[PDB]
Structures are given as C-alpha cells and as structure tokens.
C-alpha cells in the first residue's frame, strides 16, 4: 500500500559539485572518460 | 580494504545482477553482501576507494535503470562508521 | 560454456515451465531457482553465450503470458569471478 | 593517505562543521586546523583522492549556508613531498 | 591501485607534457608511451581511480593548444586481466 | 572457439577501450593488436561466434565518441585454414 | 557444439550452394544429405547454437535466388539424445 | 585436378544429357556425378577449374532452356569446403 | 597456377575482407600481407586465372561496404620471374 | 642554493597552498617560507636559479586565478640583497 | 648497362603493375622494391639505357590512373659507385 | 640540467636545424633524436632552465621557415622523475 | 672526414636520390644516410668539404625541384656540433 | 657560470651604469672592462642563462637614455669554450 512514490537516482554526496575545487573544473566539454558525463546523475 | 561502502537495492534480483556485474565490470569493487530484503527488494554491497565506489555504482545505476523492473535508489558512503559495519554483518 | 542465461517472474509456475524451456532449448545447466520474495521468483542456468541467449528465448515466448507473467528475461555472457561467489 | 583536501571558511564555527563532514563522510585524518586572520579559518585533511573528493564535496554542499559559507574548496592530489614543513 | 587512465595528441611534445601532468598532478604509475604511427601519440598511467582522473585532470587542459593538440582524453574505469600482453 | 572478431579505429583510446568492451561483453581472447599504420589500430580477438559477435557490437557500440570514432567492424566465423600467417 | 541447422528445398542446386552458404557462414559439421522424394533435399548440419543460426541465416539469404528456392530453413538448438540415432 | 563445380538442375532427363553432353562439348570438365533427384528433378555435377566450368555451364545454359520442362538452375561453386566434397559423394 | 591476383583497400578491416573472400572463392593461396602505410594495406593472392577473376571479383564487392572501402583493384595474369623476390 | 627569490601574495591560505604546489611542480625549486601577513593575506617565499624561479612563478599565477579569491601579488626577485636576507631568519 | 630507372606511386597496386611493365616490355634487372611510408610506394630496375627508357615509359603508362596513380618516375643512366649502399 | 627543452617539426631538415642551434646558441646537452611517425620528427636537450629557455627561443626562432617549419616548441620547467625512465 | 654537412629532404625518394645523385656527381660528398622520415619523407645525409658540401648541395637544389612532386626540404651545415654526431648515427 | 652577457656603450659612465645594474639585477660575475676605443666601452659579465639574460635586459633598459647610450644588446647563452682568448 502507502503510495509506492516511483522517484529514480539521487547520487548522494557525489562529489562532482564545481566549486573552489581546482584539480575538478575539468569535464567542463573536455577529458570525454568514462561516465562522469554521461547520463548525468539528475541529483 | 576499501572502506568506501557502495551499496545499491532494487524490485528484483535480476536487476540486481545486472547492478553485481556492473559493478564487478566498472572499477575495484569488491561485492561483499547479496541479500534479500523480502517482497522483491534486493540489495547489493560491495567495497572500495571513494572514487572507484562512486563510478561503480553510477555504471550500476545506468544498467540498471531500464532492467525488468528497475532500481529504487543508488546510494555511496565516503567515510563509514565502524560502527556501521557489524550491521553489515562485518 | 560459463554464460549465465537467468529470468525474474511472478510464481513459481511461469518460473518452471521456464526452466523447462531451458532445458529442451539449448546446452544448459540449472545453478539457481531462487526465491526473491514476495512473489518472485529467478531461474539461473549456466552454458555458452549463443546457447543461453536460445534458450532465454524460449524462456521468454512461453513466459510473459503464463500463469501470473513474466517479468524479466536476461542474458549475462561474462560472469565475473567476483561474482560467482554471491552465486 | 598523501592525497590532500583543504577548506577555507569564514568563522571557526563552519570550519569545524566542515570538518565533521569531512570526517563522517569519508574515513579520512585532517592534520591543520589554521587561522589565517581576519576571520579566515582553513582546515587540512589527509586521505586517498575518492575519499577526500567525496570528503570535500559533501563539506562544501553542507557548508555553504552556516555561518559566512565557503570561501574556498579545493584539493591537491599527489602534493609535493617539499610541501610538507609548510603544514 | 590498478585504474587505467591514458591520452592521446597528435605529436610527441604534447604527449610528453601531458604525462608531466599525469605524473605531476597526481601520484600515478608512468607505465608506457607508445607511437600508434603518423603522429598519433599515447601515454598510460596506472594508479587509483580518483588519482587517475586526478591525473587526466592537468594533461586534458595542458595539451590542448600544445603542437597539433589533444586528440583524445577518455580513460579506463578497470581493465581486464588479459588486456595487459596489448599493453 | 575458432571464431575470429576484429575491429578498427583511428587511435589507440578507442581501440583499448573497446577492447576492454569486447573483454567485459563475450568470452573473447585479444589475440592481436596491429598498428596497422596512418592512425589505425586494429584488435583481432578469436572466440565462439556468438559470442566475438556480442563483442564486436558492443566494441562498436562503445567509441561512437571515444577517440575520433570507428573506422570498421563486422565478424569472422571460420577464416581458411591458411590465413593463420595473415593472423 | 550440438546444435543442428538443417535446410530444405525443391532440388539439391539450391541444397548444395546452402551447404556452401552453411561452411562459409559458421563453424559447423555437416552429416546429412537427404533426398526426400520428388525433389525435397535436405541438407543436416552440426554445430554450435550462434554457429547453427548464423549458418542457415546465410544459407536461406543466399537459397531463394536459386532454382525453386528455400522451402523449410529450420533451427533446432538440443534435440533429444534418441533423436540422433535416427539421424 | 579441377575442384570448382558446375552442375544443373533440369525437370526431365533429356535436359540433362543435354546439358551434360554441353559440358563436355564446351570446357575441357569431367562431370562427377548424375543424380535423380525425384519427380523429374534431375542433377548433373561436372568438376574442373574455374573457367573451364563457367564456359561450360555457359554452354549449358544456353543450351537447355526450351528443352523438355526446361533449364531450372545453373550454378557455379567455384571451391566447396572440404566437408563439401562427402556431399557431392567423395 | 602463378596467376597473381591482388587487392589494395583502407585499412586491415576490409583486408580481412578481402581475404576471406579470396579464400572462400576459389583455389588461391594468399601469399601477401602488407601493411602499406598510411592506411593502406594489400592482399597478394596466386591460382589459376580464372579463380584469381573470381576471388578478385568477390574481394572487390565483400570489401568496399565495410570501412572506408577499397580504393584499388589488379590482376596480374603472369607476374615475370624477375617479380619473383617482390612476393 | 640558487638565491634568486620568487614570493606570490594571496587572499587566503588556500591559492597560497596550491601556489606553493605548483612553484614545486613546475620546477624543482625550494621554498624557504610561509608567511600568514594578516587580515587574510597569506605569503609564499620560494628560492632557486632565476629561470626555474620564473618558470614557476608564472605557473603559480596561472593555477591560483581561478582557485579561491585568486592573486594579490606576483612578482620575481633575481638577485635579492644581503640587507632583505635579516628579513628571511637572520 | 646499370642504368637505373625507378618509380614511386601511391600504393604498391600500381608500383606492382609498373614493375611488371618493367620487366615485361624492356630486357631489364629488378633491382628491388621499397616501401617509403605512407602509402608511398617505389620500384627499383637497373637495364641499358634505352631498355630502361622504354620500360619505364611502358611502366609510367599502365601506372597513370590505376589505384592512386603515379607519383614520380625517373631515369637516371650512369648511377654512381656511392649509391650502391642507398639502394 | 634537469630543464628539459624539446622541439618538434616536420621533417629532419627543420629538426636537425634546431639541433645544431640548440648545441651551438647554448652550451646546454641534446639527449635525443626520435622520428614519431608521419613526418614528425623529435629533439629532446636537457639543461638549465635560462639555458634551456635561450636554447629553445634560439631553435624556434632559426628552424620555422626551413622546410616545412616548427609545429610543436615547448619547454617543461620542472620536469618530473618518473617521465625519464620513458624518455 | 669532412664534417660538413649536406642533407636534403623530399616527399618520395626520387627527388632524394636525384638530389643524392648530385650529391655523388658533384663533389668529394659521400652519402652517409638515406633515411624514411614517416609518411612519405625521404631525406638524405651526405659528408664532407665545406666547400664540396656546398656545391653539391647548389647542384641537388638545381635539380630536384621539378622531379615528381619535388623537393620539400633542403639545406647546409657548416661545422656541425659534436653532440649532433650520435643523432647522425653515432 | 658559462654564460656570456656582455655590451657596449658610447662614454664609460653609461659602462659603468650598465655593470652596476648588472652586478645588483642577477646573481652574475663580471669579468671585462674593456676601452675599445674611439668613445666604444664594453662590459663582460659572466653567469647562468637565467641570470645574465635578465641582468642585460634590465642594465640595458635602464641605460638606453643614461648618459650618450647604449650600443648593442643581444647575448650568447652557452658559448664556445673556443672564446677562451677573449678572457
């Protein structure tokens, strides 16, 4: 019962927030690895 | 020991699969717990460093979004408590 | 062959007649009839990439219709060794 | 771990919770807890890059609306070993 | 750890100065260049997963405007255990 | 498995990742990487046909964007006898 | 493998170049060639399943041009092990 | 010494000598085999090198397309497998 | 006999394309296997004149779909003794 | 022992810290001190031969822009007196 | 007569063909092949002077558009003692 | 002299033009020649980092309108251990 | 042996070995290289008086230009660096 | 150091000017007072590349207008042991 909700993905605590960072700043259309672009987590 | 905790539950165990082999195919994880919640939920746990949890998981939650039923939540955490772990059954 | 062919349904019913359909499609070895919970039920078979895939085939033509349905059919080609273990 | 994180705020009060965050998020040992003057407080965490990446993510998500918020966020890989007397 | 990240250019300069910044960055493993031929130009780095993309970080925005330029950054989030002999 | 796979890209990111696809997508064995020359990068793979036939998809699958993109792919079941000093 | 493609058509011209289309498309062992009566000709393969559905897929893409063409291009992954003896 | 195989399908045994008898009259061919297939299906297999066939299942061709039934296929297997050769009786 | 057939194409894709169909042809021995340079690779094929038409024939079509396609074509019909070290 | 000196300013201790970073990474050049000024500002003190001291400095002053509330001052000194060394721990 | 005349086209079809030229149409010695790079491709013949003349005329004329085309063709007729180790 | 000055061209006319301005302008240490591939030639010097400067300003300024000219001048101020070793 | 140096750089190696053979036709050069640069580059290295170095050099750049696609690269070295000697094969 | 800086100046009080901003703007030795002659004074100064070349560029700058000016600014970085007699 109780509203089962349908909600998807949440990445918590991902840290990939560009901020002060410094080393990060980088995927910015550039580095193209893996799936720190892809299908953004949608938080 | 990877300390990084990911850990991931969805309705069915064949998405739950589909989570284990992702994360076994994505970075060095080690998957320590495959356990049935009961009425479908199924939930994978697997260990190691915070960015290699974090990439697993995320390839875990691609392949697993679209998967029978799917996924409920994907979920990491950096720093655990020790006093977590024996909830995990250590 | 190391393959797993492996298939989610609602009953136990849909979940025999399926590995039925394993078996008479092609090589096959049964290592998994699991209870999920709740209604669900996983088949498990091991054998080579294009003999699982036939044989999820047939699984799923007399599955998704059967009994209470289908509710997932599947095809794993490379079981890590990490995760024999958790089977 | 080699791998360095390192926090600047404005007032002690998000430094500190900061670094809690620091702490529950990641198993990672911060090593300086500074006062630059004026106001400015930087806090030193030592750990592996995913952790302290995580660590230092979360602690600028979860800091920005205490006190004065971040004034920076950043974190050093493989820092020079020359570095260490500076800390 | 055992993560592969590597890039490529299109030139050796480029590439030698992108696995400065590997190696400068973050602390990963230099473990191989290799001339692919006609100017294409790669370089691996081993090492753990956010140190490896902590090293990707410095060479993707070093190489960029350096000799004919980057030609490509993606990187490896684990390899298998065969694809070494192709490495 | 006498069932051969091979694929072409210009660069080797594309080439190792897809690679590394094929490694984590059939029961495949990379017998060969070929610096073909101009650029191109060749993998040959042996394996059951099914199977190198799941991997040559997914290789070709994965560098749409990795590298600068394909150049060819598609599958051998059974070469002649004597193309083997051709492999 | 155990698998068993197997073909017919009006003639054995067509049954023949399917044979052909059969070695050149997969792996496989042929060990049948039936006449059937008033120009049925079957042709019996043996092979892996994939190998099996690559073999008649080629065969019936190249047996309509010819002669009268396909008729029956069957696919069976496991017969029974008392069907063999009758074959 | 000739492995390629030219061989025609013909309803009929008078398109079949026929064609057969053009074989040995266009190429320098030895046919292998003449098989009845069943129904008036009949077969004849001439084995040569790869010119010599085409010339003569050319010869073939042009030869039986009105006689009797008629011509049903030509065809012109220029190097079976060796698993082939069981099937064409050796 | 010594009739030398022999296609040039982009790349080692359809150069394994071209050879299986030199193969799978007629009665041709490949008996060259050159990486040109530059992206282009040549298959060197004898027989019998006859068989080199049709194995060239089936190269030319069974490797231009695939990849960037052939860009060359030849039939030798007798290569002179003095081109005898050039294979 | 290169005497050339080069010293950057910062507002806040973080662009001082990945200044003094990238004075090592760039060239292997020796820092002789840290200096918190007050009211924020924060000093880095380098030393060694007058190219790598420059070749440093400069890569410094790209990374710390961005990084923090970024420069305040940058500067290279080549030959620094013997009346300034009392001012570097006589 | 050492008078040598040589060839470079773009792709070793019709370098091959031009050398068969060579040796088909003039009374002269195949001194041997190279392979520049890049798909650039040469031809080496040594001959009396007219003979060497006439060869490389016919060898330039079935060279002129097959595959890539020529590039260069030359004659020299008294080569020197020092080249001997450049060619 | 752990200053390392490197420069690229097009060909060794441009590259051995920076060579010899690299050893006759400063009295800094070649360490190496390397042909990348496609044209692109390599010259690696060592020294210290004003002398390495000079010595590249020198070779950058002397070799570009030679040949085909410089592509790729750059100079790495605090070049790394671990490249070395891949040098 | 003169240490002066010719060498001469062309796309395909018939305009360098027309040059070398103005190198061999001009003066007392002798060719101590003929290498493959990458991607169709020919160059050739020839030794000797510095005069002699320059008259041949003078007569491959009268006759090479106009040879196929031609000359790409040419020039001379005076007094060549001893360092330069092992990139000159040692 | 090995390294040469060195100027001339029409009137020995802009010599001097020009040493003395040597001597203070790097770490440099001087080595040469020299009367040319006719009004021609020339100063020598010896250090690193570094040093000398920043040194000259500042006691140049800061002399063009002192006193009649300067005459020539350009300076060797690693020279010829051969200059020995200049000392």
Same mark, same amino acid.
């Given at each position: ?5 349908? &909600?998807? @993905?949440?990445?918590?605590?991902? &840290? ?14 550039? @580095? ?12 | ?6 850990? $991931? ?5 064949? =998405? ?9 195919? %994505? ?9 049935? !919640?009961? *009425?479908?939920?199924?939930? !994978?746990? /697997?260990?190691? #460093?915070?960015?290699?949890?974090? %990439?697993? /998981?995320?390839? *875990? ?5 679209? !998967?029978?039923?799917?996924? !409920? %939540?994907?979920?990491? $955490?950096?720093? =655990?408590?020790? #006093?977590?772990? =024996?909830?995990?059954?250590?």
């Amino acid at each position: 019962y109780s509203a089962k909700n349908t &909600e998807g @993905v949440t990445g918590n605590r991902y &840290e990939d927030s560009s901020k002060i960072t410094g080393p990060f700043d980088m995927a910015e259309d550039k @580095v193209t690895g893996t799936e720190q672009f892809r299908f953004e987590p949608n938080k | 020991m990877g300390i990084a905790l990911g850990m $991931i539950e969805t309705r069915g165990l064949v =998405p739950a699969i589909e989570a284990a082999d992702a994360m076994t195919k %994505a970075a060095e994880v080690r998957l320590i717990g495959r356990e049935f !919640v009961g *009425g479908g939920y199924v939930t !994978v746990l /697997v260990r190691g #460093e915070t960015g290699a949890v974090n %990439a697993a /998981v995320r390839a *875990g939650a691609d392949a697993c979004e679209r !998967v029978g039923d799917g996924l !409920v %939540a994907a979920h990491i $955490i950096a720093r =655990p408590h020790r #006093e977590v772990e =024996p909830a995990l059954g250590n």
